[PDB]
Each structure stands twice: as structure tokens, then as C-alpha cells.
Design a protein around this ligand. Structure first.
Ligand SMILES: *[C@@H]1O[C@H](CO)[C@@H](O[C@@H]2O[C@H](CO)[C@@H](O[C@@H]3O[C@H](CO[C@H]4O[C@H](CO[C@H]5O[C@H](CO)[C@@H](O)[C@H](O)[C@@H]5O)[C@@H](O)[C@H](O[C@H]5O[C@H](CO)[C@@H](O)[C@H](O)[C@@H]5O[C@H]5O[C@H](CO)[C@@H](O)[C@H](O)[C@@H]5O)[C@@H]4O)[C@@H](O)[C@H](O[C@H]4O[C@H](CO)[C@@H](O)[C@H](O)[C@@H]4O[C@H]4O[C@H](CO)[C@@H](O)[C@H](O)[C@@H]4O)[C@@H]3O)[C@H](O)[C@H]2NC(C)=O)[C@H](O)[C@H]1NC(C)=O
Ligand SMILES: CC(=O)N1CC2(CCN(C(=O)OCc3cc(Cl)cc(Cl)c3)CC2)C1
Ligand SMILES: [Ca+2]
Ligand SMILES: [Cl-]
Ligand SMILES: [Cl-]
Ligand SMILES: [Cl-]
Ligand SMILES: [Zn+2]
Length: 806
């Protein structure tokens, strides 16, 4: 029953309970508004601006906004009221002055936060549309800004807004796409439709709930599509005139532009100039209204986008029908990404192995690449949810995938889309912060949108719920912090074992041709097994082990590890390759050489027989023999304690990285420090496995098989100084390579490794923070750098895209 009234209740903040008619900014979407909502709460009379002739008018209540004398007192002047009627200047026309301290009216307990979020606002608009966006450009240059901000995958609207709100990856918050099916529910979820209003889709704790539970009041985040933008601004400004005990501290505004147009005209279509002018106009309204209320040096404002927009046309559609004969057995979630499942789970027929193989490298020009989800690059964090179908298609920028052509012509009207991989430049979006708490005229490096929840909590005095941000990593945006991060404590201390075992105690089936054996180089190799060159091979301290386990630090002339007695292989192996260092080969008599380590018992060692009896599984080394400093030191690289299991297919990638690329990187960057190691993520949750989760061992052994291998490659940002003597900031790139028994992912893998290997490594680029989650290690513990800067460094991603931003 919707028979009450909205008289003096327009946009009430406390949504009331059915049946009783609602007057809040969501009632439209629940068809439950009172009959007089429109009349009272959605006035349009006389438009949204004052003219010289409306000035000092007699308050007429039918007007959408007022230019009457009493209007400041009522809190419902038009945004431009002071300008037109009281000879004031527009906010944009004022010079910008640093806001060193909040300048808040009596009663404001804390600077309010306003989040101005724009759909489809591609990063490069900040430069390319600069001439038509004066307000936005003032915010950007007077406040703090990034050249761009990286969205989450998929680069769709709901996954990204709800990531902004929660600090979580879509796999965790549960909104994993524009549309989705959940099997435990048995239900679907669509942009259109009323199913999406049910609470059970929505995980984590969004900002407005974090605020509420901690005593801070929030304006709504969700606005109804049919409430125009100018009313939404006026509503925020009304709310800001409420009394202290009722007034919210955090507000959001959403724009459907420029996404809406961009889908029609493409990102840079001529029709795109006017949407950008409109957004800007709206921003101007807000800032003018803030200045009327004397809040313009009090409020923190965040101008943030959800995703970008790419050029995409109907004729750049790949059809599953041209790859499969069995197209009726499947369902496709289509578009800029693909997700395939069985059409009927009635069937023990449908087979995912065959589907994938039918979509792998089938046409030279193929504009997509199929994946089981757990083999997606780990940086996408797109797998740990039952709503993510096992089969995924990653689509080339600028293309679509559809099931069949009737699907595209009976179920070209579009020149723009989005949803691609979140490293793609076109998909990048924007960030500006302006206000007392933000820095002044400061550029910051690009960052990921998962990090903002933490900062908005900080801006508000809130303790963040657990999230996927690294709290501290964005402290450099803020003039005044309020959160001071500290390093997690080491949980397991290492053992420093000495020589305890005689070769004859080892029965590992391991042999080496090494018995061609001086007071000079016997003091020498004692210093190298104690830790003399550890100052050049371990540059930033030993990683801390953040869980309970048993492990040994092993020192060597050329490298230091790392060594786990539970997993029987290193957790980490560290080494430095200076610009001048030279590559050698594995001499022939040493090809099959594996040596027992006399610091480590037989029972905590790998054995060579298990590899002999395992026909799928070979082995490799974490510190490469190829980069030995001397023929004598090269014997160190063959220790059984440096060995790890590697599929032959994977050894081709790994040897190329070790033999060619490490040296190339040391050339380009003037020395690199490398840390490499294994990763175990059998349950694809992005988190280090306990031993009882490992699904594969080297046959007949307790030697677990890694899902991935990582490397972190550090040098000096100022590359005129060498890696092992760097005075200031560091530069890093990292990867997490999937440990696969075939190279089906690389369509040119039958060519020389120089044509396909490095391309794979780039696809599987990672943040040091990703590796931390996956290993339970903590890196960069002893540097000269501030911890904040190090957290920034740990969140960096090297993307391999060309010149990007705004
Ligand atoms: C990114 O960030 C996130 C957030 O930090 C990280 O995700 C977190 O990671 C934790 C470890 O994986 C995980 O802990 C689990 O949680 C189980 C219960 O979790 C429920 O409660 C959560 C809390 O909500 C409350 O929060 C505040 C306090 O913070 C309260 O005041 C409020 O009242 C809140 O209600 C809740 O968020 C969580 O939500 C998920 O599940 C819902 C499903 O209905 C979804 O709606 C929602 O979207 C979430 O979905 C994600 O997470 C689930 C897993 O939780 C996952 O399946 C989905 O794919 C999706 O991705 C829950 O409702 C708890 O029971 C777990 O404990 C088991 O294991 C431990 C091992 O030591 C044992 O001690 C324990 O016995 C137990 O085992 C038992 O169960 C086993 C298997 O089930 C069984 O074999 C065994 O025999 C036992 O019976 C464990 O602690 C967090 O829940 C998770 N949080 C979120 C928000 O996802 C994430 O890892 C980060 N990512 C990276 C890459 O770093
Ligand atoms: C169903 C549909 O087509 N649409 C819902 C839609 C997006 C969500 N809307 C919003 O006001 O959102 C503001 C907002 C900001 C931020 Cl930072 C985070 C969230 Cl979760 C929401 C309402 C309009 C577009
Ligand atoms: Ca795991
Ligand atoms: Cl989707
Ligand atoms: Cl191969
Ligand atoms: Cl363990
Ligand atoms: Zn869109």
C-alpha cells in the first residue's frame, strides 16, 4: 500500500518499511513511491539556473530551485544563485589556493567526503578533452591526480563500482560480471531486472555500511536512473544543510555519461565532446553549491571513473559457430569477454577439455584465447567464485566474441565497448582528489582501484573492513595520514645449518661427475657457505616467513636460499647479476649432475630416482648454472637443494628466461637482483597452499608440484647507479608463470623461444604483493626507503603497454 505522502519527506535518508510509501531516492526502482513523489520531490519548474530577473523573487514553492532571498536559509538555492544574483564568481573562475587546514562551518565534526563517479570516463579524456572541461581540469591540477587508475577485471560497470565501494576483487565481493548465474542459488543476475536487488549477490562490506556501523552517516550510493543529474546535485546540497545529528558525512554522485554516448559513437567520436561538457557543467554546479554553503575549502571531493572505453564494431566479432560444430550444447556469456558452460547440466556428454582444444590456436588471426579459469594470469584475480565459469575467453582489445551470428543481428548499433583485460590502455580510467586532506598540486603514480576503499576510510576516520588494498600504499596521496603501517612480524625463524652429513649417507639416485678436486680457496669457500657475498646476493634483507614452518638459510658464492624442509625445495632463492656479468654454458659432463647438500639430511632432500620414474616430470634449478661466477662456483648450482620440479614443456620457458633474459635485463637496468621461487595454489584462491591442499606430487615421492614459478627483479630506479649499490628509489618488475605441461597457451611455441617466451612472461606480469599473498613471504624488509614507498613498490605492476594516461 503506497497511500501515504512525501510532504516534507523528499529524499529522506531512512528508508521506511513496506507497506508504507517511500520518499527516498530508491523508491522509483522498487515501484513503491508515494503518489505525490513526482509533484513534491521532482520539481522542474523554471529549470536549474537563476537569471537576473528571478533575483529577490517571491519564494514560489513550485520551482525546481530558488533565487528568492530566503533560499540560503532554506538550503535550496539554484547552484548559480550567488553568481547571478549576488555578483559572486564561479568556483572555476577563482584562483586556486592551497587548503592547508579544513575550513569548515560551525557544527562540521569532520570534512565531508563526496565521491563523484563517472561511467566510461577513459583516462586519456583528461588531456584530450581538456579544452572543454574547465572545472575538472581545475580539480585535477590544484588537487592530487594520477595519470590513470587501473580498474578491475572484468572492466564492466558493476564489478568496478562495487570494488570501489569495498576494496575487494570481484571474485571476493561476488559481482563477477555484467550478467551471472549462481548454481547454489539456481538464479541469474542482469543489469536490467529486479533480481539484482536481492542482498545475497552482494558480498563484503561497502563504504556506506562501514560508515554506518561506526557512527558515521552516509548519503545513498544508488541513485534512480530517472532522477536527472541536476536534481541529484541539489539533493546532495540539501542533505549538507541538514543539522549536525542528521547530516551524512559521505556522499556519492553517479553519471551515466560518458559511457552511454561512447557505446554509440566510440571513445573519441565527434559526438563525445558534448557529454564531456555536460559532466563538467555538473561538476561546476556542485562546486558552486559547495561555495554557496561555504564548504568549498572543507569538503574532500573524489573524481573517479569505473572503467574506460574502446573502439569496437559488429564486424569485429568472432563467432563460436566457426570453431565448434556442437554450438547448441553450450551457453555463452558474450561480448568483450567470454564465459562458457554447459547449456544443460542434464548431460554427462558436454566435455570442457574438447571445447577448449577446439578454441585453441585454430585460426592464424584468432582474436580471442580460451582458458580454464585457474590458468588465467594471476594478476586478474578472476577465479575463486562459483559464479565464474570454468571456461573463459580473453578477448583481444577491439573485438567481440558471440556464439552465432543470429545472436548479433537478431538478439551495427554500437561503436564502443569495454570489459577487456584491465591492463589495456583503453580500459584505464581516472582519479582526482581535491580537498583539505589531499595534497596540493601533486601528481602521484598510477594505482589500482582496489586501494581506494582504505583511503576513503582514512578520509573519514573509519577502520576499513578486511580488503584487498594494501593499507599505506596510497598514504602518499594525503597531506595528513591517520594510518601508519608497520611490517608484519616474522613467524618462523630460519635455521643456519652447517656441514652435518657425509656424501655416503645419501641414497638419492643422484650422481655428478665432480671428483676432480690449496689453502687460498678453502678459507674462501668457507666464507661463501657462512655468508660473505650475501651482501651482494641479498640486497633488501631476507624475506620474512609469515607462517609456521621449518626452513634453512643456505649461503653460496653466487646465491642465497630459502630452503623448506616441508616442501623439500626453496621458498625463495636470491641472487645479483651485475651489468658486466657473463653467461656460460652447462658443460656436457655436468648435464645430468645433481649433488647432495651436506648441510641438509637425506630425509629432507629431493631424490633423482623419482624424476627418473616420472615420465611427465623433469627438473630445473632456481639459481641458473648459466650465470655461475666461476667453474668452481657452478657446482653450487647443481645442489639437490637448488632443484625444483619442471615439466619439460615448462623447462623451455624457464631455460630461456634464465639463459638469455636475465642477462638482457642486467644490461638494460645496470644489474638486477633476482628472487625466484615456487608457488602452490591448487585451490586458486590467490593464497599460499598448506601442504594438505597439494594435488600433485612427483610420482612416488613427497615432492609437491608447484602450480606456478615467480621472479621479482629489482634494480635502481636511477639506472646510472648499479643494482648492488643503489642510493635511492628502486625499480621492480615481477611475474608469476603458470607451471603447465604444455605450451598450448602460446600459439607460436613451436618457434624459437625468442618469438613467444617473453610475450608469455609479459602476459603473466605480477605485483610483488600478489607473490606475497601466494607465498606467505614478506619482501624488502631492510632498505633505506620509507615503508610507505615500499608498499607503493609492492603494489606496482609493470604492464608492458605503450605511453598511457592523462
Ligand atoms: C581479498 O580480501 C578478502 C577479504 O579479506 C579475502 O577473503 C577472505 O579470506 C578469508 C580466507 O580465505 C576468508 O575466511 C574464511 O571465511 C569463512 C567464513 O566467511 C564468512 O564470513 C565473512 C565475514 O563477514 C563479516 O565481516 C565482519 C567482520 O570482518 C562481521 O562483523 C560482519 O558481521 C560480516 O558478516 C564473509 O565476508 C564471507 O563472505 C564470503 O562468502 C559469501 C558466501 O555466501 C559471499 O556472499 C561473499 O561474497 C564472500 O565470498 C567469497 O569468499 C568465500 C569464502 O569465504 C568464497 O567461497 C567465494 O568464492 C567468495 O570469493 C563468509 O560469509 C570461514 O568459515 C573460513 O574458515 C575455514 O577454514 C579455516 C582454515 O584455517 C578453518 O579455521 C575453519 O575450520 C574453516 O573450515 C571449515 O570449512 C572448510 C571448507 O569450507 C571445511 O573443509 C572444514 O572441514 C571446516 O568445516 C575462513 O576463515 C574470508 O571469509 C574472505 N572474505 C571475503 C570477504 O571474501 C581474500 O583472500 C583476499 N584475496 C587475496 C588474493 O588476498
Ligand atoms: C541498474 C543500472 O543500470 N545502473 C545502476 C547504476 C549504477 C549504480 N548507481 C549509482 O548511483 O552508483 C553510485 C556508486 C558510486 C560508487 Cl563509488 C560505488 C557504488 Cl557501489 C555506487 C545507479 C545507476 C546504473
Ligand atoms: Ca591457495
Ligand atoms: Cl559479463
Ligand atoms: Cl613445448
Ligand atoms: Cl604448510
Ligand atoms: Zn558501458
Amino acid at each position: 500500500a503506497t497511500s501515504g505522502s512525501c510532504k516534507g519527506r523528499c529524499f529522506e535518508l531512512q528508508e521506511v518499511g513496506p507497506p508504507d510509501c517511500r520518499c527516498d531516492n530508491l523508491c522509483k526502482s522498487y515501484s513503491s513511491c508515494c503518489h505525490d513523489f513526482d509533484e513534491l520531490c521532482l520539481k522542474t519548474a523554471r529549470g536549474w539556473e537563476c537569471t537576473k530577473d528571478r533575483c529577490g523573487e517571491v519564494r514560489n514553492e513550485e520551482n525546481a530551485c530558488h533565487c528568492s532571498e530566503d533560499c540560503l536559509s532554506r538550503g535550496d538555492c539554484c547552484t548559480n544563485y550567488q553568481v547571478v544574483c549576488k555578483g559572486e564568481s564561479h568556483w572555476v573562475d577563482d584562483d586556486c589556493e592551497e587548503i592547508k587546514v579544513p575550513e569548515c562551518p560551525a557544527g562540521f565534526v569532520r570534512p565531508p567526503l563526496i565521491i563523484f563517479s563517472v561511467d566510461g570516463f577513459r583516462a586519456s579524456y583528461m588531456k584530450k578533452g581538456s579544452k572543454v572541461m574547465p572545472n575538472i581540469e581545475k580539480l585535477r591540477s590544484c588537487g592530487t591526480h594520477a595519470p590513470y587508475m587501473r580498474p578491475v577485471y572484468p572492466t564492466k560497470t558493476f564489478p568496478n563500482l562495487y570494488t570501489l565501494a569495498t576494496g575487494l576483487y570481484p571474485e571476493s565481493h561476488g559481482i563477477v560480471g555484467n550478467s551471472m548465474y549462481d548454481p547454489v542459488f539456481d538464479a541469474s543476475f542482469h543489469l536490467r531486472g529486479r533480481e539484482k536487488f536481492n542482498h545475497r549477490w552482494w558480498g563484503g562490506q561497502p563504504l556506506w555500511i562501514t560508515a554506518t556501523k561506526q557512527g558515521v552517516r552516509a548519503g545513498t550510493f544508488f541513485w534512480s536512473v530517472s532522477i536527472p543529474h541536476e536534481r541529484r546535485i541539489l539533493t546532495i546540497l540539501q542533505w549538507l544543510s541538514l543539522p549536525d545529528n542528521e547530516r551524512p558525512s559521505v556522499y556519492a554522485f553517479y553519471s551515466e555519461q560518458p559511457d552511454f554516448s561512447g557505446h554509440k559513437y566510440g571513445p573519441f567520436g565527434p559526438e563525445m565532446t558534448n557529454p564531456l561538457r555536460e559532466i563538467d557543467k555538473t561538476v561546476g554546479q556542485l562546486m558552486d553549491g559547495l561555495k554557496q554553503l561555504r564548504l568549498h575549502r572543507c569538503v574532500n571531493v573524489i573524481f573517479v571513473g569505473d572503467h574506460g572505453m574502446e573502439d569496437v564494431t559488429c564486424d569485429r566479432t568472432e563467432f563460436l559457430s566457426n570453431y565448434l560444430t556442437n554450438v547448441d550444447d553450450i551457453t555463452l556469456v558474450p561480448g568483450t569477454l567470454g564465459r562458457i558452460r554447459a547449456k544443460s547440466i542434464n548431460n554427462s556428454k558436454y566435455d570442457p577439455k574438447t571445447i577448449i582444444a577446439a578454441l585453441t590456436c585454430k585460426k592464424p588471426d584468432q582474436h580471442f584465447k580460451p582458458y580454464m579459469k585457474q590458468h588465467l594470469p594471476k594478476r586478474l584475480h578472476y577465479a575463486n567464485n562459483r559464479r565464474i565459469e570454468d571456461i573463459h575467453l580473453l578477448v583481444d582489445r577491439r573485438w567481440h566474441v558471440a556464439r552465432k551470428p543470429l545472436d548479433v543481428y537478431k538478439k551495427c548499433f554500437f561503436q564502443g565497448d569495454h570489459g577487456f583485460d584491465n591492463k589495456v590502455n583503453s580500459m584505464q580510467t581516472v582519479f582526482v582528489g581535491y580537498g583539505p586532506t589531499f595534497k596540493y598540486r601533486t601528481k602521484v603514480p598510477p594505482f589500482e582501484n582496489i586501494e581506494l576503499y582504505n583511503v576513503m576510510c582514512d578520509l573519514l576516520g573509519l577502520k576499513p573492513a578486511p580488503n584487498n588494498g594494501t593499507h599505506g600504499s596510497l598514504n602518499h596521496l594525503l597531506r595528513t595520514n591517520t594510518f601508519r603501517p608497520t611490517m608484519p612480524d616474522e613467524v618462523s625463524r630460519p635455521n643456519y645449518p652447517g656441514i652435518m652429513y657425509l656424501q655416503s649417507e645419501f641414497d638419492l639416485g643422484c650422481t655428478c661427475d665432480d671428483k676432480v678436486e690449496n689453502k687460498l680457496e678453502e678459507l674462501n669457500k668457507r666464507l661463501h657457505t657462512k655468508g660473505s657475498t650475501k651482501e651482494r646476493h641479498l640486497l633488501y634483507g631476507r624475506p620474512a616467513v609469515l607462517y609456521r614452518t621449518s626452513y634453512d638459510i643456505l649461503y653460496h658464492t653466487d646465491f642465497e636460499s630459502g630452503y623448506s624442509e616441508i616442501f623439500l625445495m626453496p621458498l625463495w632463492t636470491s641472487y645479483t647479476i651485475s651489468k658486466q656479468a657473463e653467461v656460460s654454458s652447462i658443460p656436457e659432463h655436468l648435464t645430468n649432475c645433481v649433488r647432495p647438500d651436506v648441510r641438509v639430511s637425506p630425509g629432507f632432500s629431493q631424490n633423482c630416482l623419482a624424476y627418473k620414474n616420472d615420465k611427465q616430470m623433469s627438473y630445473g634449478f632456481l639459481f641458473p648454472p648459466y650465470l655461475s661466477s666461476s667453474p668452481e662456483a657452478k657446482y653450487d648450482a647443481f645442489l639437490v637443494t637448488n632443484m625444483v620440479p619442471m615439466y619439460p614443456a615448462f623447462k623451455r620457458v624457464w631455460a630461456y628466461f634464465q639463459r638469455v633474459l636475465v642477462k638482457k635485463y642486467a644490461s638494460e637496468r645496470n644489474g638486477v637482483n633476482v628472487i625466484s621461487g615456487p608457488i602452490f595454489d591448487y585451490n586458486y584462491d590467490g593464497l599460499r597452499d598448506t601442504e594438505d591442499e597439494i594435488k600433485q606430487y612427483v610420482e612416488g615421492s613427497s615432492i609437491p608440484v608447484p602450480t606456478h614459478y615467480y621472479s621479482i627483479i629489482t634494480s635502481c630506479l636511477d639506472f646510472t647507479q648499479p643494482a648492488d649499490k643503489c642510493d635511492g628509489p628502486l625499480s621492480v618488475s615481477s611475474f608469476i608463470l603458470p607451471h603447465r605441461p604444455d605450451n598450448d597457451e602460446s600459439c607460436n611455441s613451436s618457434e624459437d623461444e625468442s618469438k613467444w617466451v617473453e610475450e608469455l612472461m609479459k602476459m603473466h606480469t605480477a605485483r610483488v604483493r600478489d607473490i606475497e599473498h601466494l607465498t606467505g613471504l614478506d619482501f624488502y624488509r631492510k632498505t633505506s626507503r620509507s615503508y610507505s614507498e615500499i608498499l607503493t613498490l609492492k603494489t606496482y605492476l609493470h604492464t608492458y603497454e605503450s605511453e598511457i594516461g592523462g
